[model samples]
Target: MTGREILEKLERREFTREVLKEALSINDRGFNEALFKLADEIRRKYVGDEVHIRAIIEFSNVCRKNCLYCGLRRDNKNLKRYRMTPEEIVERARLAVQFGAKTIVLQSGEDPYXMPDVISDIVKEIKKMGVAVTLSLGEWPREYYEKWKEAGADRYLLRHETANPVLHRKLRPDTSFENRLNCLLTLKELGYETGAGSMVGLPGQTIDDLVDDLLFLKEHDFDMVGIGPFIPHPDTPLANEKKGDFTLTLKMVALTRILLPDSNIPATTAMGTIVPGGREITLRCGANVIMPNWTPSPYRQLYQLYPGKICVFEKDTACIPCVMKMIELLGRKPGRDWGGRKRVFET
Candidate 1:
């Protein structure tokens, strides 16, 4: 390990903390280009040129926990909140499917008033539209997970936020790190395509914590992972803190792509919000997915995990065409199927 080149070890899918740090900290332009080259090669070989687009419809902004970094935190008075009626959520999904969304992601905060039964009915209705349905409302009871899965939900995305245990406790005061892991494990046992990932450049996070995040994703083999920057939200406790570093966030995306070669990793809208063409850049780096926002207006603007969220101002019909063009811009096809994890073949 000490004598060999870092990228060489990484090519064989072997790494230690030192090797990862070296790969992540490459500052020279040539080495950075080399990192992207290898990451892109791995991504193309494992996942091919098809990029899956999951159209997201955020139906609610009210939340139960006051996560210090989120705008929908229960404590925030600066933000207005709304929850779409069951018919509205279902209708939104229907229109999104009409606009060519193969997957419809229903996203929201953990508002207890938004009952599990209501969500189950929504899932059932959307599943009838013949598109894959994914849930992103925050943690709920194990029983609720069972109920919704039984209602035809195809996937669930509950990002772990950060792998640093103390950071998890420090940032999300009301949620349990153990229980979060339990929720992820429960999602898997119930036969859903469970996904998890983390934020880069969190206030107290370190390079070591970043290593833990990458290794954890690899160790668990989640069906999908979403890595993005920790952009500060104006209404949340972290508002005045410095924004998450862009290049560091890119490194995390690149590293995650390298680690989870066969896993579906999205070039999150958060990346695009932080910098123009951010998603396009990540598409080339290692990402194989992009989630286009279909959450209807006024309400869309309120579902702010971070300020300046992309696609909030666009029409309900706006994102799909734009996202399709964006994918084709990279010479990658918009995925035609359910956008499940690509299987690796020993050809």
Candidate 2:
């Protein structure tokens, strides 16, 4: 089937169960047509032509947890590391604000050194300037999460990575699948908008895993879902593992949009790095959000969670404007504000 045929099927919501079955089937050319259709249909109804862009300013790389898939795994000696102080983070966020970013995503590896007090202070400072903040700096004590909420953080994004406990253990030797789920649910319960997601092609992942993710999202009702390909980091254990499939990544984005229609789904840069025009294809298929890096180039390479990552360059000041043009090519408008807009759920 052609892309248009897939769009037609999705328009009728006819691709759900069958698409899932086909996607997970053993066939090599699995379900791209159905996936694209689902994307177009869901996007037309829920997202429209407005493109939501979030600027990720990776503030710190010093982390305590050593997830095997991460480039910053505690044991990885090849990674260079650094931290951006609260004042410096605020300054970078200010530039993201100027670029029309309504949501500022402050991401870092699981680092205990940059504690909640520091995060709360930084979030408070940004919110004082009227911008909303989303933190993805790994797990924290519930008390600190509440403090950050009180300090004006509106959302939190923590990727569960995988739901399968045994596989999860294999991926992150010390991390618990149950702990990740509890943290996500607790954030939602505490009035923090929550985001959780998985990689497209993690080693040993299955269709059942993807279905479990969909059911979990339905059950918990996450505020945002970040799905993308699992690119292997050369310096890590899975460096030589097969790269996540590009076409399958798009299919997952479309399927995610259909399954969680109102959820904030982003075209991750990881997907972009793996395929040309990946972000544009995601938007056209149904994704409503974009996350561009606002992290200073001097520290971009330092926050290396994955290898062959895109958009980190020293003389790339023109990158944001270039993004605007690319967004225009997709027949969408950048949100009027990226950081301060109350999330769709808050409304």
Candidate 3:
């Protein structure tokens, strides 16, 4: 099928992986541009032009897992480690709300030391402020997931990282693909708005694999999807590998909007790290969410998931205005609501 035909099917909610793969393979500039433009139109028709801001506080830098692509891997001894006390985390969430954030994303490397009760208290405290709370802490026991959900956590973002099982196994030596999906399913069953996403370009990751990632998101009926380019870090095994392409990453974001029109998609900071004005470009294409860094400066630089993460040096006070200015410049307003996935229904 031609790319235009696939797009037509997409609009009708009638498309298969074969059709999507064909559409995704389009290399002609005009055809690709048309695809993105249609995706943008769909985004506006379904989700509107308001950009939701989720303030992310990177509260901990210590991780137990050693993912091959992450700078926070256990083997990266040169990196400093830090963890914000529960009091500190709650304080940050309060400050984020004061800065016009409607949701507070508490992200950290998987640190076992930060017990479930500790996290639960943090979620309880954040929820009291009447803003939504989302957690991006890495894999943990089922009890932990249950505890957080009961503690008023509204969403959980545990990225599948990659869809290919072999590639996933290679990159995350200690975690299984089956287990990762199970975690996401558990989150959903517990009534949390579940999120799952993958890196756009990884070593040995192909266009076909990316199509599978999109299909996985569709099949699972995720409420939110966070897609970003795979930026290389100097401390990890894939440090010397080539970074993901900006254009392809944007295409992935746009395609995701086309496929999952109702799902919340973030214009990830990793994109802006690789290209100038990347976030603004994505907001025009199909993305509607932006996660501003609200981590206090003292610990911001320490949470290095990948290198050159944007806004590490900037204060949380400075970061919000910078982001609001970018939103205004794009002629889009900052979102005022919790900004959960807004699903449009067919008549």
Candidate 4:
């Protein structure tokens, strides 16, 4: 049957493993509708229209790794690198807190400039502000993990990017798969809440890579697992490469929800950019978290890890409320307190 016919099948909730496999194989029109139906069902069954919004602050633009698609991947020349002082970070973090953000994410390129000591100080300062911190910096030593946890960081988000080792190497020439996974392992061991994810249309990624990524998450039991399309960066090697499909992204979100029902799946802004209503579609499709930028207007343009970021230039009021509206549209409310470590939410 065609994708539209498959959507009819999905609306009736009759898709089988075979039908799902067939759908994955066929990426034609109406594919999103079928996945949206699946996501809508999963949201109803597991998570109601309660949106979990995370306050994301990109602390710096300097990174060491040379990933093919990221704007900050060490090789990019267009990016102007800068590191925010722990004090600067804390100041902006207060904005997130003022905006009712329960969790504050300190993200940066994997650069050595902002070492663990600096990051630990930032985490401690944010904790002092009465908010939880999630670290998204590149791979670091186990000691760094220990310091952040001791300082009271609440969670971490490190995307393995691709599970297939060969593909991983192709995409990130300067990094290692073992190193990325080791970071997750280190976070898990240090008693820190952990999150790991991969790019949906990562170059040379096959179904096998997707399967491996899912299995890795299943084994690790991460607190959050998000996936978004591979948007090419103009300064990178893959700038002219074809992008990944948004339908696959939605399907992956649904599958992630079904496989790890309790995991914090985000409807990444990348999805919304890849397909319209990407945020809404993700929530209905089984994603529960939305990382809206709370970075100050002056520094907002500096956090462009990927091209075409969703909320970079918008004012916090416009950015945050837009996502909140989408959450309400999904029948879920934007949370006030930092969501606890284990999918903590009050019904």
lDDT of each: 0.87, 0.77, 0.88, 0.76
lDDT by residue for model 2 (1-347), tens: 44444445655656455545555442334356555665677676765667777788888887777777888888888777888878898988888777767788899887787687888888888887676789897777788888888888888998888878888888888768888888898898889888998887898988778766666666676778888888889888898888889777777777777766777888888888899888878877767888877888789867787877777764535557767887888777877654222323422
Comparing 2 with 4 on TM-score, the higher-scoring candidate is: 2
Q: Evaluate model 2: give its lDDT.
A: 0.77
Q: Find the 10 residues in a row with the least total lDDT in model 3.
A: 6-15
- For candidate 4, the TM-score is 0.88
TM-score, ranked from best to worst: 3, 1, 2, 4
Those runs of model 2 whose alpha carbons end farther than 4 Å from true positions after fitting are 1-19, 26-31, 314-316, 337-347
Model 4 has an lDDT value of: 0.76
* lDDT (Cα, tens digit) per residue for candidate 3, span 230-298: 999998899999999988888888888888888899988998899988888888889899998999978
- Each candidate: RMSD: 1.7, 3.3, 1.3, 3.8
Candidate 1: list runs displaced more than 4 Å: 1-4, 345-347
Shift in Å, residue 191, candidate 1: 0.6
Model 1 weakest 10-residue run by lDDT: 1-10
lDDT of 1 at 337: 97
Candidate 1 — what's its lDDT?
A: 0.87
| Candidate 4 Cα deviation (angstroms), residue 222 | 1.9
TM-score winner between 3 and 4, please give it.
Answer: 3
- Highest lDDT scorer: 3
